[PDB]
Amino acid sequence: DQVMQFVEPSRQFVKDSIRLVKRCTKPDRKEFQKIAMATAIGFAIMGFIGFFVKLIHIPINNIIVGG
Binding site for another protein (CB under 8 A): 13, 16-17, 19-28, 31-32, 35-36, 38-39, 42-43, 46-47, 49-51, 53-58, 60-61, 64
Cα–Cα distance list, 13 to 6, 10, 24, 53, 54 (Å): 12, 5, 16, 47, 47
Minimum Å gap between C-beta 7 and another protein is: 16
**Which residue's CB is nearer to another protein, number 1 or number 26?**
26
Instruction: Give the HSE-up count for residue 38: Cα atoms under 13 Å, Cβ half-sphere.
Output: 6
**Which residue's CB is nearer to another protein, number 4 or number 54?**
54
